[PDB]
Every structure is written in C-alpha cells, then in structure tokens.
C-alpha cells in the first residue's frame, strides 16, 4: 500500500523526500517464505522479480553479481527503467550469506560478508551499473544507469539456529 | 494423439528391462501425470497444478540410467543427464548449475516447447551431502521452477538475443544416485540395532534381494541420517527403488531383450548364412564372471566380444558352415565352438 502510494506521489512536489521501508522475512523451514512472494505477483500491476543469494558473489569473481538482480527486473518491465525504478524485489535465502561466526575477519567471504557489503547501497539508493545487455539492446558498453532509491527490496531467509541465539 | 496408458508404458518398458516391477509402475504413472498436465494448459478452473519429481534410489549397476533413457526413447521428447559430483556453487572452479540447461537446449534443437517436455536425469546425487551443502541449496530452486538465463548460442546464431528463459517447473527431474550405506541406516530403524556380535545379521549369503526389499521401506527420515537436507527431500515426493541384479537375472537379462547381446550376434551371423546358438550352460558361467568383477551388465559386452573375437576372424574364411553352438568352455578361452556345418 505504501509503495503504491509513493508511485502515485512519485512527483514528490512537497519538499519532503519520502523514504522506503524494506522488509525482512524470517520463518521456519517449509513455512511459506518463498510462497508469499510467488503469490503476490499474481495480483501485482508492477514489475516484480525473484532471485537467490546462494548464487551471488563479490564483484570481479566468476560467480554472479548483485547487479544481475536489476537485470531480471527489466525483463519483466519491458526494459523500461522508469517502470523498473518502481518495482518490488524478493531476495530468497538471505540467511546463507551470513558470516559463519567469522567475527575476526580471517579471510574474504565473497559468498557471505562480501555479498552483504555490495547491497548496502542498493537497498539505500545508488546509481547501479546494470549489466551490459540482457534484452533487445544490442550494445554492451552502454551500461544502463538506474537509481534504486525508490525500489523496495524484500529479503527472506530461514536463519537455522537463530532460535538458540534468541533464547 | 492420446498418451499411452501406464499399462502400455509398463508392457513396453518390460520388453527392454526385466525386473524392477515396482519401479516400473512408479515411473509409468508419475510421468503419465507429469505430461497429462502439460498437454492441457488450462484446468477449467483457476488451479495451478504442480510438479512431482522422481528420486531413483537404487544400487550401482541396476539400470537407473537405462530406465530413464528407455522411457524417453519410447516417446519422442528431449532427454539430458548430468552428474552432481561434477557441479559446484558459484565462485569455485566447479561447473555451474546453469550449464545443465545448456545441454538440454542443445538436445532440444533450439526449441522451448520440446525442451519444456524434456526429462533431465541427474546422477551421483550422493557424496555431496553435509560435512557440499551449498551445492544442494542451489539445485533446491531449479527443481521447483527457475527463470534461468542461458546464452542464446550454439544453434547457429539463434534469432533471440535476450538471454532466452526456460521455465523449470515442467521438466521431470529424475535425480538418481547409489546411496552406499542407506541399507544399514534403514536396518537400524526398522529392525534389530545389532550389526556386530553373535546375535547380529551378517550379510554374506549373497542375498542380493535383501537390499531391494530394505530400500523399499525407505522413508524421508532415513535420508536425513544420510546427510540430505530436509528441503531437498521434500522437493522429491516420488521415490522408486531398484533391486540388485541377481545371477539368474544376468543370464535372463541378455535372453529376452530385443537388443540382447546374444540376439545381436545372431542377427549379423544370420546375414552371412550361418546360425548362432548360445547353450544355457555358457550363460551360467558368464553370470559368475560379472559378479567376480562386479561390473554389473556393462562388462558383459567385453566378455562375449572377447570370447567371439577369435571366432569372427575365422568364420568368413570357411565354407559349408551353417551352424555354431557356443559351449561353456568357449568364453574362458580353452575351447572353440564346434563347426558341424
């Protein structure tokens, strides 16, 4: 509801700059975390895409990058940055990129802390560097620019073991 | 073109596969359903039918691949396979999971409709359990629907150049593997927990059927002890166990099949005007040989070929010969089949 309102009020004529509130879904296994995301798209009227954090890695590595998330959103938004800048995202398995009690920072956890350090500006807002092309667009150097300061980013995980930490 | 009833599918599968009667029924109805839905996109309602994956937990040299291969060949659909031990998570040198989709598209001949009706066959699922876990986490999504990004190339510059998507919620994922040790795990849950001692049950009577009946009683909890994460098991509702090829089976396995090794030589020798026979005693010796090397039925091709190599080198150099009767001593290499013309 709040998101939809921001869209109708995207002109933001009022001097204030309305922010966004990102959600963090925590639930036991087999409870329906990834189900609610698939069920919301059935009624949404705006581009929505799903992803997984077990395939993401820091920049400059063989794995995936955090900017791929915005590429999937354009496939669903007919490569319309304006529409893509007012869509919702759902990052599944956000609990598998958590440091394995490596508080001393022994090595670089490109699959854990490394991925978290790359999203700190995507959830807040920054001029993301979209991958060269994943659509009709033929060139690659274009490096389409997009702003993520009005793009909701949901993150869900199972956090197996957090129940003990709480107790 | 009304799909064939499971009975027909079983009767056909029986022709090329002797035994594993329970698994045949499972893989007949399970796939008859997986396709009855795809041919009817709508359901005269707002329901969204799901997918049911098949888990083939069988012993080595049991023919899990054969069943999958034969099931696809009986029909006209694409078929691909893989090996879990040759895959790894992202960031590592190991082949990425997306690579599997490439092979599927290659076999599909640059088509989506066909590819959507394909049956991939993962193998060697075991040995990548806990203590890896990361590799089992990625596959957890692929088997339950994923809009993957596959490079559109390999089909002579595919007109589509937008990282062509493929829905993975309609592909039958027949994930197999030889779970070495599960038989013991199950026995500790369904019978006496004594494996060592005077009152335990040592498996030394060549009771190859024991494992088959044991695996039939497998439950998801049994798999958790093996290492398999609960979520992965949940994605595979259907489970079909395969028995262990017995000595009688081996002799039988190359008797009935239309593509039996014995019949194969009969066809080519008949083209030259000479007959070929295989005394049952010879077959009994062959069976023991395969168990001595534990090469299932893969090594039967080398046994008979080696035993008939010399023979083939002399038959075209002879005349008036119209019959051959292989004896038990022919295979060991101490005799040559008599030529009675």
């Amino acid at each position: 509801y709040n998101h939809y309102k921001r869209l109708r009020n995207g002109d933001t004529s009022n001097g204030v700059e309305l922010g966004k509130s990102n959600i963090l879904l925590i639930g036991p296994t087999g409870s329906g975390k990834t189900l609610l995301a698939e069920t919301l798209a059935r009624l949404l009227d705006v581009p929505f895409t799903m992803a997984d954090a077990t395939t993401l890695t820091e920049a400059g590595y063989v794995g995936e990058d955090v900017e791929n998330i915005i590429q999937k959103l354009l496939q669903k938004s007919d490569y319309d940055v304006q529409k893509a800048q007012r869509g919702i995202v759902y990052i599944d398995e956000i609990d598998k990129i958590s440091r394995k009690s490596d508080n001393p920072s022994i090595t670089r956890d490109v699959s854990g802390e490394g991925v978290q350090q790359a999203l700190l500006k995507l959830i807040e807002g920054t001029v993301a560097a979209v991958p060269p092309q994943g659509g009709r667009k033929h060139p690659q150097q274009e490096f389409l620019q997009v702003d993520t300061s009005k793009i909701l980013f949901i993150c869900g995980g199972a956090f197996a073991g957090l129940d003990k930490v709480i107790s | 073109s009304a799909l064939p009833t499971p009975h027909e599918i079983r009767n056909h599968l029986d022709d090329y596969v002797i035994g594993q009667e329970q698994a045949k029924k499972v893989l007949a109805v399970a796939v008859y359903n997986h396709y009855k839905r795809l041919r009817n996109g709508d359901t005269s309602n707002g329901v969204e039918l799901g997918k049911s994956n098949i888990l083939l937990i069988g012993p080595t040299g049991s023919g899990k691949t054969l069943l999958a291969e034969t099931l696809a060949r009986l029909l006209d659909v694409p078929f691909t396979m893989a090996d879990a031990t040759t895959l790894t998570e992202a960031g590592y040198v190991g082949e990425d999971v997306e690579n599997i989709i490439q092979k599927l598209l290659q076999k599909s001949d640059y088509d989506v409709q066909k590819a959507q009706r394909g049956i991939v066959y993962i193998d060697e699922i075991d040995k990548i359990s806990r203590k890896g876990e990361g590799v089992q986490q990625a596959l957890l999504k692929l088997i339950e629907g994923t809009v993957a990004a596959v490079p559109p190339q390999g089909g002579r510059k595919h007109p589509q150049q937008e990282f062509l998507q493929v829905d993975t919620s309609k592909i039958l994922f027949i994930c197999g593997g030889a779970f070495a040790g599960l038989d013991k795990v199950i026995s500790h849950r369904v019978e006496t927990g004594s494996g060592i001692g005077f009152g335990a049950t040592v498996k030394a009577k060549s009771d190859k059927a024991s494992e088959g009946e044991l695996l039939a009683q497998v439950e998801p909890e049994d798999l958790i002890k093996f290492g398999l994460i609960p979520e992965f098991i949940g994605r595979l509702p259907v489970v079909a166990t395969l028995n262990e090829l017995s000595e009688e089976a081996l002799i039988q396995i190359l008797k009935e099949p239309k593509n039996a090794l014995t019949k194969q030589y009969q066809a080519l020798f008949n083209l030259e005007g000479v007959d070929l026979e295989f005394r049952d005693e010879a077959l009994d010796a062959i069976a023991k040989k395969a168990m001595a090397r534990k090469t299932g039925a893969r090594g039967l091709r080398s046994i008979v070929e080696a035993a008939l190599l010399d023979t083939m080198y002399d038959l075209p150099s002879m005349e008036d010969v119209e019959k051959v009767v292989i004896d038990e001593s022919v295979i060991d290499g101490q005799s040559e089949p008599l030529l009675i013309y």
């Binding site: - | 040995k127 359990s129 203590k131 040790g181 004594s194 060592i196 009152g199 093996f226 290492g227």
Partner: protein, 192 residues
C-alpha cells in the same frame, strides 16, 4: 593401547573406540572382577541404550570370575526394570555372580558357547566384631543366599530345594550341562 576404528558413512569419517563402537550396536562387555566402579559403569551403558531406543534388544557378554554380591545384584534389577530385552552370553568363565547375571537374561535369548565353563556357589561374606553384630550380618547374608536362589530357580524353572543342594557348594557345569539346569536356552556353535 586400546585400538581405534572408524565407521565410514555418507557424512564422513569418525574415529571410535573398539569398545565404544560396539556399544552403538547395543553390545556391553563385562570383563574382570566385579566392583562398584565397573558395575555402575555398565548400568550407565544400559540406561543410555534405553534412552536411544527402548524397543531394541541389548547384548551382554559376560566374562568374570565372580565378585561382590551387592554390586552384582544391582545389574539384575536394571535388566528386569527397563523394557528392552537383555541377551546374556557366557564366554570363558561365569561364577556365582556371572552365572546369576546370565540366567537373568531374556527368555529364549540366553546363549553360551560350547567351550565355556559355569560355576555356581552360595554367596560369600564375613564380619569381625561383637557377637550381636555377627548375628545381624549372619542373618542378613542368609536372606541374600535364599533371595538369590529364589531368582535362580525362577529363571531356570527348577525347584528351590534342588537349587539349594546344587548351590550349597561350588558346582561346575559345562555348556550342554547348563541347558539341563535351565540357566540357558540354546548353545551357539556356528552361524546358521
């Protein structure tokens, strides 16, 4: 000094003790003289098996020359109290306490090897002090003797008076002879 072994499974490799590895299979070894420390330790093994699975049989291999009476009777109450069936195996030697713990096993699950020896005798004791104190201990040990024979006769199926004569003095019995008395149900010689 004690050799170690590994149990290979899908999870990985784990090093286990030779005696500990068998405990996983519900197997307990009763070796050496009976005492409070070894007897209490055996009881812990019995309870642990009950916690894991109260429905699976427990195997007890006995090899002892006898010992304290109080320590031995502690095990008897532990085997009969818990639900699981306890299988007793006589190996090499079984004295008054070792044999008492042998016939106390589950019916139809008491085995003994052919080259095994079993001895039974009345309990032993003693006390030094005042006369009135000796009468108390002398009267107490008599109850133990009669109480123990009542259990031996019940599990064996023999009569109390007949058992008293047999246990009046040291009575050595072989494996086949043991079956006649009723201490055991069968003899294990070869597999199947």
């Amino acid at each position: 000094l004690v050799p170690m072994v590994i149990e290979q499974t899908s999870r990985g490799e784990r090093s286990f003790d030779i005696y500990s590895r068998l405990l996983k299979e519900r197997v307990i070894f009763l070796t050496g003289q009976v005492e409070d420390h070894m007897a209490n330790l055996i009881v812990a093994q019995m309870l642990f098996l009950e916690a894991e699975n109260p429905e699976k049989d427990i195997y007890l291999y006995i090899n002892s020359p006898g010992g304290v009476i109080t320590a031995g009777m502690s095990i008897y109450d532990t085997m009969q109290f818990i639900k699981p069936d306890v299988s007793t195996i006589c190996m090499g030697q079984a004295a008054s306490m070792g044999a008492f713990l042998l016939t106390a096993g589950a019916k139809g699950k008491r085995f003994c090897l052919p080259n095994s020896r079993v001895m039974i005798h009345q309990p032993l004791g003693g006390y030094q002090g005042q006369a009135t104190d000796i009468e108390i201990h002398a009267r107490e040990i008599l109850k133990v003797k009669g109480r123990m024979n009542e259990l031996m006769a019940l599990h064996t199926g023999q009569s109390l008076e007949q058992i008293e004569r047999d246990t009046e003095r040291d009575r050595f019995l072989s494996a086949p002879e043991a079956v006649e008395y009723g201490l055991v149900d069968s003899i294990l010689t070869h597999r199947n």
